[PDB]
Amino acid sequence: PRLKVKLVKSPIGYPKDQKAALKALGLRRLQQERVLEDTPAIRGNVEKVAHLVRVEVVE
Amino acid sequence: MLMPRRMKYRKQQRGRLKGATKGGDYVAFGDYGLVALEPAWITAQQIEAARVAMVRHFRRGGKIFIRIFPDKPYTKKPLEVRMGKGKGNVEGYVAVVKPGRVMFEVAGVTEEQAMEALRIAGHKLPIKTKIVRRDAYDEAQ
Amino acid sequence: MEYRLKAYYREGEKPSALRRAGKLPGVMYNRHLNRKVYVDLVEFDKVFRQASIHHVIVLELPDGQSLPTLVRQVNLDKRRRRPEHVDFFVLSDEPVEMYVPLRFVGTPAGVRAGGVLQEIHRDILVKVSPRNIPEFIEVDVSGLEIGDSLHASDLKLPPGVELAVSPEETIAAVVPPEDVEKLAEEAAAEVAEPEVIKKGKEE
Amino acid sequence: GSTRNGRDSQAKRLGVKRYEGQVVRAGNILVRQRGTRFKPGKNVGMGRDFTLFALVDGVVEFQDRGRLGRYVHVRPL
Amino acid sequence: RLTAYERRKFRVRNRIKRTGRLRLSVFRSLKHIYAQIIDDEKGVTLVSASSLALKLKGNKTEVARQVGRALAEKALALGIKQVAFDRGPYKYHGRVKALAEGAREGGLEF
RNA sequence: UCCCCCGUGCCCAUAGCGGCGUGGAACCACCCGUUCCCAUUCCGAACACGGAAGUGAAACGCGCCAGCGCCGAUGGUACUGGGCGGGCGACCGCCUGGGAGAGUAGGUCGGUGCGGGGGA
RNA sequence: CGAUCAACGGAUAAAAGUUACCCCGGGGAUAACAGGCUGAUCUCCCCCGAGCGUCCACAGCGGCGGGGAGGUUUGGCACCUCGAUGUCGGCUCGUCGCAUCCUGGGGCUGAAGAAGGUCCCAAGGGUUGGGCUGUUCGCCCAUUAAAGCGGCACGCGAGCUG
RNA sequence: CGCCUCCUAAAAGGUAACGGAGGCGCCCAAAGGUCCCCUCAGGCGGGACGGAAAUCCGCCGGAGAGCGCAAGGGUAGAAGG
RNA sequence: CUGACUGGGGCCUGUAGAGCACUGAUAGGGCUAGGGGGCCCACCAGCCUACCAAACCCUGUCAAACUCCGAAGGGUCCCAGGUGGAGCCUGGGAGUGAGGGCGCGAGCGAUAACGUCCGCGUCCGAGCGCGGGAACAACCGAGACCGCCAGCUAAGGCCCCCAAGUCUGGGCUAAGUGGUAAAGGAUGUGGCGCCGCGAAGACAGCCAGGAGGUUGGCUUAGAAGCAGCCAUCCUUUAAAGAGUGCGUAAUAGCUCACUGGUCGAGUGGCGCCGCGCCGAAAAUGAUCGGGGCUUAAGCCCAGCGCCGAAGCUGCGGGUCUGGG
Numbered sequence A: 001p002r003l004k005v006k007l008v009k010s011p012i013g014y015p016k017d018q019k020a021a022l023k024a025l026g027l028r029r030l031q032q033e034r035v036l037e038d039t040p041a042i043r044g045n046v047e048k049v050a051h052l053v054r055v056e057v058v059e
Numbered sequence B: 001m002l003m004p005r006r007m008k009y010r011k012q013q014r015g016r017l018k019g020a021t022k023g024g025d026y027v028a029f030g031d032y033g034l035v036a037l038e039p040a041w042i043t044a045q046q047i048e049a050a051r052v053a054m055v056r057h058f059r060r061g062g063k064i065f066i067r068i069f070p071d072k073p074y075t076k077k078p079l080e081v082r083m084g085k086g087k088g089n090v091e092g093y094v095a096v097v098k099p100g101r102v103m104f105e106v107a108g109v110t111e112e113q114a115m116e117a118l119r120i121a122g123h124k125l126p127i128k129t130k131i132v133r134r135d136a137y138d139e140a141q
Numbered sequence C: 001m002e003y004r005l006k007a008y009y010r011e012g013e014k015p016s017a018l019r020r021a022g023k024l025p026g027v028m029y030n031r032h033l034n035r036k037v038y039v040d041l042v043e044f045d046k047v048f049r050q051a052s053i054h055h056v057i058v059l060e061l062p063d064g065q066s067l068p069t070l071v072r073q074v075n076l077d078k079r080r081r082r083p084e085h086v087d088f089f090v091l092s093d094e095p096v097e098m099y100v101p102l103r104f105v106g107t108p109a110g111v112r113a114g115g116v117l118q119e120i121h122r123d124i125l126v127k128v129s130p131r132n133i134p135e136f137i138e139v140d141v142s143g144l145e146i147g148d149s150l151h152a153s154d155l156k157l158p159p160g161v162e163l164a165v166s167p168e169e170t171i172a173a174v175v176p177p178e179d180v181e182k183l184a185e186e187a188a189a190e191v192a193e194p195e196v197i198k199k200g201k202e203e
Numbered sequence D: 001g002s003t004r005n006g007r008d009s010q011a012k013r014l015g016v017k018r019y020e021g022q023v024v025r026a027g028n029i030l031v032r033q034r035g036t037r038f039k040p041g042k043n044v045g046m047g048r049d050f051t052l053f054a055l056v057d058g059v060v061e062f063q064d065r066g067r068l069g070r071y072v073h074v075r076p077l
Numbered sequence E: 001r002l003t004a005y006e007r008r009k010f011r012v013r014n015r016i017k018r019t020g021r022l023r024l025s026v027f028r029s030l031k032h033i034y035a036q037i038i039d040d041e042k043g044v045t046l047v048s049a050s051s052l053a054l055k056l057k058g059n060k061t062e063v064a065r066q067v068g069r070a071l072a073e074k075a076l077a078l079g080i081k082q083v084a085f086d087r088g089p090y091k092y093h094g095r096v097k098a099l100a101e102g103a104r105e106g107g108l109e110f
Numbered sequence F: 001u002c003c004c005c006c007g008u009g010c011c012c013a014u015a016g017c018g019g020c021g022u023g024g025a026a027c028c029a030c031c032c033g034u035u036c037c038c039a040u041u042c043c044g045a046a047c048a049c050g051g052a053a054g055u056g057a058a059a060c061g062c063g064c065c066a067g068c069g070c071c072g073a074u075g076g077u078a079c080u081g082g083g084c085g086g087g088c089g090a091c092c093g094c095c096u097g098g099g100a101g102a103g104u105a106g107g108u109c110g111g112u113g114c115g116g117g118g119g120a
Numbered sequence G: 001c002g003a004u005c006a007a008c009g010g011a012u013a014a015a016a017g018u019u020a021c022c023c024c025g026g027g028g029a030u031a032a033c034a035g036g037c038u039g040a041u042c043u044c045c046c047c048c049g050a051g052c053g054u055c056c057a058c059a060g061c062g063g064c065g066g067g068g069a070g071g072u073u074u075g076g077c078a079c080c081u082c083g084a085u086g087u088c089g090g091c092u093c094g095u096c097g098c099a100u101c102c103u104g105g106g107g108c109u110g111a112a113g114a115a116g117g118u119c120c121c122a123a124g125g126g127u128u129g130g131g132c133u134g135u136u137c138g139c140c141c142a143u144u145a146a147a148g149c150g151g152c153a154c155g156c157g158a159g160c161u162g
Numbered sequence H: 001c002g003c004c005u006c007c008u009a010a011a012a013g014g015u016a017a018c019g020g021a022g023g024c025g026c027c028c029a030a031a032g033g034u035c036c037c038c039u040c041a042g043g044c045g046g047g048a049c050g051g052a053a054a055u056c057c058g059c060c061g062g063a064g065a066g067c068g069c070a071a072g073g074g075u076a077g078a079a080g081g
Numbered sequence I: 001c002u003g004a005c006u007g008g009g010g011c012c013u014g015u016a017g018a019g020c021a022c023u024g025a026u027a028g029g030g031c032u033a034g035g036g037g038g039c040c041c042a043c044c045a046g047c048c049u050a051c052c053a054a055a056c057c058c059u060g061u062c063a064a065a066c067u068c069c070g071a072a073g074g075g076u077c078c079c080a081g082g083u084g085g086a087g088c089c090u091g092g093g094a095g096u097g098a099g100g101g102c103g104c105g106a107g108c109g110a111u112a113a114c115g116u117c118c119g120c121g122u123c124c125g126a127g128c129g130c131g132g133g134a135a136c137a138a139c140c141g142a143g144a145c146c147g148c149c150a151g152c153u154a155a156g157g158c159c160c161c162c163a164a165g166u167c168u169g170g171g172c173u174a175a176g177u178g179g180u181a182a183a184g185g186a187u188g189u190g191g192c193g194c195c196g197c198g199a200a201g202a203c204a205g206c207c208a209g210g211a212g213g214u215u216g217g218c219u220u221a222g223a224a225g226c227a228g229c230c231a232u233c234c235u236u237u238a239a240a241g242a243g244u245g246c247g248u249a250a251u252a253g254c255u256c257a258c259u260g261g262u263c264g265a266g267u268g269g270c271g272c273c274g275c276g277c278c279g280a281a282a283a284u285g286a287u288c289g290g291g292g293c294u295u296a297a298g299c300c301c302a303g304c305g306c307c308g309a310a311g312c313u314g315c316g317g318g319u320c321u322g323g324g
C-alpha cells in the first residue's frame, strides 16, 4: 500500500511544526498530491496535518 | 459576618472560575437547598444578607445551614491611585462558588416556608439559583 | 416492598450516545461477574426514588435471567444534577453491608419547646443476609430535648442484623431554632480583621 | 505606596543531567540536587553538594527501590 | 521500630558494600561461629565455613581462629584473595577478631 | 527434588499493627558465671569473655483471624495533546486520540535467590 | 593584606544645590488641556420586600443585599496631536438631548373643596431683574406660570472681553 | 539597587511587573578529619522538695524532634547525640 | 545525512484535575480539658449548663507560597523515515537590541481599559498586494515572476443594488425579533412531561349552606379567624381553618377555604425545552451597508446546484538552481 496525500488547506497561520510536517512530506503547494509509502513515520506526519490534507489509500 | 479567624497568607491571587463545582453538589443536612446556577465570588455581605433574610421569614423556628464560606481575601487599590506600588489592600472576603453547589440548606419547616425563604434568599445573591429538595440521589452520595 | 427494572447489555456504544438516546449507562458486578449494562433513565428514576439504596431492585436481563441487586453507587452530573452512571451490585446468599432506613417515631420534647430534630443519619450501615432485609429500623425520639441525642448504640436491631459502624456515631439531635431575637446580638456582635500566620523570624 | 518585598534569587538550574540509556564518560555529571533525591549507586560518586557524577565510562540506569530511595547507576560498556 | 543491634548491623554493612569488595560476613552465636564470603552483585554466597560444619571442640576463641584458617583454606582454592571483613553488629574483638586473624594467616587478603 | 531451622540478599507494607495458637532433638535465644580478653559519663542492662543446669517465660521462627493499616479493579466522570463551533463576558459546547483522583467490587495476616545445618 | 568600590561588572585619588533671568538639541517614545478607550467613582432607573405609615409591606416610603443605563464628576490608561490641538469665567449668537422647571393630557392618592404628594404622556413654546464674589456654582433681595438639568473641543478668543 | 529561599512559572531548563512572602553582608579550634558507640519530639501511667515544664522508671510513638542562623530540599540504614 | 517534523523505546517532571494524609482554613454534630453562668458552700469538694470554647471522632468543605494522589503533555537519549534556501564547522559583511494585534495559560488592575507584565503560538511589522467581513495592519480565505476577453475552487455568498437559487423538503417566530444589554417580571406562542380534582358528576355561570364549644389563649391598651409566639384541640356534620382575603376602635358585614341543587365534559397547580414580550433615557438627520423582506429575503434541521481570489488548472514567456 501507498499513501496519496493532497494538500487542500493552507498552512498559513498554523504552528511551525505543522508547517515542518508538510515539508517532511515534501508538500509545498496547495492541491498538490504526493504518493508516499505507508510506514508509521510517514503516517504520523500525515495525521499531524490531517486537518490540512485529504488522504487516500492506494495500490 | 463570616471571615477566617487567621490565615497563613494575607493576600491571594485571583485565579479562575472555570468548570462546575468540585463538591458541595448534593443536599447533605437539611430538607431543601439553594444551588448556584452560575459562577461567582459571593461576598460575606451577601451571605449574611441572605442568611438574615431567611431567619427573618422563619421568625421563630427552623435551622439554617451555610455550606459556603468566604476564605478568599478580596483586594482593592485605594481610590484614585495609579497602577503599581504593590498589591492592593484586603477589603473583604469572598466565597468562590461554581455551578452546582448547595450554598444554603433549610430544616424543620413546612415546604412552602422553605420555598419562600430560599427564594427571598436567592434575590440577595449576585447569581441565578435553583431550589432543590433532598432526593434519594442526595441520600446515595 | 420489591421493585423490578428492565436492564440491557451494552458493548461499545458510547455513554454519550446512550444518554442522549434517553438511556442510562451502568455496570453490573459482584465477586464472579462484571457486565456493562444500560437501563432506561426515565423508568429507572421512577423506581429509584422509591427504591434508593435501601430496597432490592431486580434486573430483568433480556437474555432471560433475573438478578437481585442493590444500587450501590450513583454518579451525578455536578453541573446539571442528573444521574449519569449506576452501579448495580448483584446480591448472593452471603451476607452483605448496606444502608437501612431510620424512622424516628415520636415527636421530641425538644421539638415541642421550639426545637428542630436534626436528622443526622436517615439510614444506618449494616451487615445482614439478603434474606433478612428490614423495611426500616424504628427509633424512639420522643424523649429528646434541646439538645439531647440518640446514637448508633441506642439503635434497637431487628432479628439477624448486625451493626456495621461504631456505636459512638451520633444519629439524630434536637437543636435550637433560628430566632429573629438573636439578630440584635448577631448584628451587634463585633468581628475583627484577620491575623496573618507568619513567615521568617516569625512562624 | 511601596513594596516591602521585591526580591528573589538566581535560579540554580538543578535536576537530572543525564537520562537512562545515555552513554557517559567518567566524570560526567548525572544529577544536580539539593539533598539526596537520588542516591549514588554502582559506579556513581556523590559530591559535597549532593552532585551525582559517573566514576567510569558507560551507560546510565535508574532504579526505584521503594523506601530505599531512587538510585542512579552507571553500567560499564 | 529498629533496635541498636539492627541499626549497628546496617551501619557497618552499608559501608562495606560501597567499597565493592567480596564480604567475609561473620555470624557469632552463643555456642557457634559461622562465616561466609558473599558476592553482593549476584546476591550469592561463594564459599562458607562454620564451626558447626567442622564439628570443632571447646574454647570458642581458638575455635574461631580455626574456622578462620579453614575459610581461607577453601577460599584460595577458588581464586578468592581480596575480600573485606564484615564485623556485623560484633565489635572487632574476641571471637570475631580471632576468626579474622585465622583468615589472615590462611592468606586471605585484608 | 521436599520439609524445618541458622545465615545473607532481592521485591519494598499483598510484607504492617492487634488478637489467638504453636516450636526447643537440632539450630537460635534467653540462660549459668564475671577468673581471663574487654566493658559501664553508675550498672556484666549493653558490649565481652569462659560456659551448658534449666526454659521456650522474653526474643525469634512458623500458622491461623480482615478490627485497624496497606494494596485495589471494571465502569463512569474530571482534565487534556491536536482539530472545530458558541457567548458581551464570567464562561460553554462538538470531533478525534490520551485519561485521572475519589469511590465501589474486591485483594492482603507475604513471595522469592544463594550458602550452610538437620530430617525423609 | 588595605573595598557598605552596598548605585554591590566596581566613570575620579578627590564633588552639593538652585533658575518664574534663561538657552539649544530632541519627544506626542512622556506629563499638563481637549478628545478617545475604561466607567472604579459620579448621576439616574430598576430587582427583593425586613420595616415605617393608628389600622394597612407597596398613598408616600424601602433595612441587609442584588441587576443595569448614561458618559455631565473625581480618576485610570498613554492611543492622534510637543516643525503648537490657545487654555477658567463673562459677552455674543445659538442648536440639540429629555432623565420636564412651567404651560397641555392623564392614572393613583392617606384625592371633601381649594391646594399638594407620587408616577405616566409630552421637547411646541417659554423659563425675569438685581446684591456679593474673577467666579462656574452657591447664598441673598424682589418678583414669577416657571425662575429645569445637561450635550455641542467643560459649543463658541482667524467672533469680542482678559 | 548585590546575594540566598519559596511562590507566581503554564509537571525538563529558563521566564516579567513599584506581583506575594522571608532571609544574608555572619559563624565554628570544633560546630573540623576519622574510629567507636548511641536515637528523637510527643502522649499516658508512676516518683521527696518539684511546679505546665529540671531529674528518675515503665509502656505506646517512622519521625511530627534535631541538624548555629531564612526557607526549601534532604536526613535516624544519620546529615542528629 | 548528521536538520525541522515524524515512528517505536527508555528515563526525567509535579501542572490540569482531584484529594484532606501533612501546613493552615473551615460550617454543623458528637464527645469533652479550660474558663463564664446558675444552685450550695469556705471546711474543700460537688451538681446543672438553649454560654464561649482546646484536643479527639463524625458529617461537609477551601488553599499560588498545602499534597496521600496525579494526568494529557513536555524535555532528553538510542534506533528508523526524513535530500531540505535542511544541518554542522572556519572565516567576511551586517542590521536589530521602541514592537503591536489576536488565541490560549498566569500575575498586576476592578472575574475595568485600543490597560500593564511574562509564557506558548500566530499574524502584522516587512504580505497597508489579492477575495470575504459595508468601510478597517494584524478575524476568516490565501503566500502576488510576467502575459491571456480560458477552466476549478477557498472564505463568503446566490430577492434588487451585486456575480450566482425568489432552490428543494420538515419545523419555529409575528417581535421588522431578526437588525447589540441584565437581575427580575408576564394566561406570548409552540412542545414535552408531573401531580391533583372529575361522569362514586368536576371546573365556569346561574343557586343555597359556610355551623357549636369560643369575645378561645403563653397575652398586652381593643385582640371576638384576621396587632407578637411556644396552641390546634373537639362537635352537628352533607359540609366549613379555633380561619385564605376585604371590614373594624374592637365587633359585625361580604367571602374563600368546604358541602348540597343546576347543567354535562373536561378542569386546576408544579416543572423543564424552542422561539419570542417587557425591563430599554443623551445630546447635528435618519438608517439592518441601502432598497426592501413575514409558509422570509428571519431562526433551527437536511440536501442538490451555481457564483466567488493574484489559491489551483490550462497555453505561452522570463530568470536562477538542480538533473540530463
Ligand SMILES: [Mg+2]
Residues within 6 Å of the ligand: A009, A010, A011, A012, A013
Ligand atoms: Mg487555513
Ligand SMILES: [Mg+2]
Residues within 6 Å of the ligand: A012, A013
Ligand atoms: Mg487563517
Ligand SMILES: [Mg+2]
Residues within 6 Å of the ligand: A015, A017, A018
Ligand atoms: Mg501543533
Ligand SMILES: [Mg+2]
Residues within 6 Å of the ligand: A028, A029, A030, I311
Ligand atoms: Mg500554493
Ligand SMILES: [Mg+2]
Residues within 6 Å of the ligand: A010, A011, A012, A028, A029, A030, I143
Ligand atoms: Mg503555502
Ligand SMILES: [Mg+2]
Residues within 6 Å of the ligand: B013, B014, B015, I107
Ligand atoms: Mg489576576
Ligand SMILES: [Mg+2]
Residues within 6 Å of the ligand: B041
Ligand atoms: Mg465582586
Ligand SMILES: [Mg+2]
Residues within 6 Å of the ligand: B074, B075, B076
Ligand atoms: Mg480584587
Ligand SMILES: [Mg+2]
Residues within 6 Å of the ligand: none
Ligand atoms: Mg493608610
Ligand SMILES: [Mg+2]
Residues within 6 Å of the ligand: B083, B084, B085, B086, B087, B088, I108
Ligand atoms: Mg499593583
Ligand SMILES: [Mg+2]
Residues within 6 Å of the ligand: B075, B076, B077, B087, B088, B089
Ligand atoms: Mg488590588
Ligand SMILES: [Mg+2]
Residues within 6 Å of the ligand: B043, B074, B091, B092, B093
Ligand atoms: Mg468586599
Ligand SMILES: [Mg+2]
Residues within 6 Å of the ligand: B021, B022, B023, B024, B096, B097, B098, B099, B101
Ligand atoms: Mg463551589
Ligand SMILES: [Mg+2]
Residues within 6 Å of the ligand: B122, B123, B124, B125, B126, B127, B128, B129, G066
Ligand atoms: Mg438573584
Ligand SMILES: [Mg+2]
Residues within 6 Å of the ligand: B141
Ligand atoms: Mg464524598
Ligand SMILES: [Mg+2]
Residues within 6 Å of the ligand: C200, C201, H069, H070
Ligand atoms: Mg532567624
